[PDB]
Amino acid sequence: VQSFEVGWVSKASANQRSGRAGRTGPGHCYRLYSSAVFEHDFEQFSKPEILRMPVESIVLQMKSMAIHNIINFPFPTPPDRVALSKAIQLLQYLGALDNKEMITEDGKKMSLFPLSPRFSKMLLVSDEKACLPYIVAIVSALSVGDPFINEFELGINKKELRSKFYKSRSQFSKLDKFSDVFRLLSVVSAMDYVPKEQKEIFMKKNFLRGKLMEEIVKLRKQLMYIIKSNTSKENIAVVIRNEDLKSDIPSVIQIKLLKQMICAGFVDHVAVRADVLFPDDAKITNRTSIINIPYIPVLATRTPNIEDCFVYIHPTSILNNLGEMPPKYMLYYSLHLGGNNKTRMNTLCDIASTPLANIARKGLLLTYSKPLTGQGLKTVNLSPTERYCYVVPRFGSTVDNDLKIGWDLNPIAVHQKKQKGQWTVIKFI
């Protein structure tokens, strides 16, 4: 994610700032930082702002600029062509960009949001069923990082501290049992109810960094100010309320609504069990730990060897230490390439099949097949252009194109109306 931070200026910019002290008459330039610090911690010519903004944000701004193509654009400094193309398909997968590269109605909004397009998608959909106080809390935690300390890092594994760590890790996930971002949501929210005087003790009990939460607490107020700005027409009138920051526990329906919030911003970083997509291709059983159980993203390229595609879950994730068979579709913030034997996945939450198609209907990843003919599978044709029927959707890559590797979603009822010779998805019935 991109953030605005206080940082040391360049040498030349500092030298210019010295100049105007002397421009009127010979002047004395004073620097709070020392000369020896000046040589080391300052860069000699401030690095271009085009490099500072995310490449995806360059495209989204450019798509706010309705530019026909990023390569037709004339530019002083190059980002590589392919990444500029990866950004376009990236934004398209999020629903921000159309198949014709034109910036969608929501596509325009994420451009307005100063935040990253992936995180900006969270901002748009965050305000659903009073779940706004969370998606800021998750987003604040995601950007700042993980306040948690791993068991291996501490060195507790002494055995009594291991139990308290286990109890501490258990009480995180009483909110969500299969999800690792929502357990964290319970913690960042829990310390809010916690008194300030007793905070350090809970923060020792749960092995939480003193300084990282205060930024999160300071970060959530800023991000709520931004969402309350953008969402309402009164983008300056809205003021940050600590009671708005205050949140009430979710319902099980809200959790499911929250799960699809997690998938909206990271729709590309979603993986199914490798055994589910290829049953019996790779030997898997309950004895094999969740480290051993493989996964494969829909967007990932198919490889000559299946194990190359295979990705695996982290041990620190609760879903590993539950001891139960994990859900079919799992979703991660980032792929951690560490570990030649197995590639480590940090997964946020478990997304179900049809709700995954819900993030797919906003996005362009979904591919819908033709209506089927069978017992009780007839199609309603109210008018010549609209029809109701069941269609099997294929997420990401289709069956015909074998370059990628994707998974097929179960058929579910849908309304289809013809536009331009193809029937768009009006709403899943």
């Binding site: 009480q171 909110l175 319970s186 913690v187 929210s189 829990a190 109810y193 916690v194 526990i249």
Partner: peptide
């Protein structure tokens, strides 16, 4: 608290 409820989260705790």
């Amino acid at each position: 608290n409820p989260w705790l």
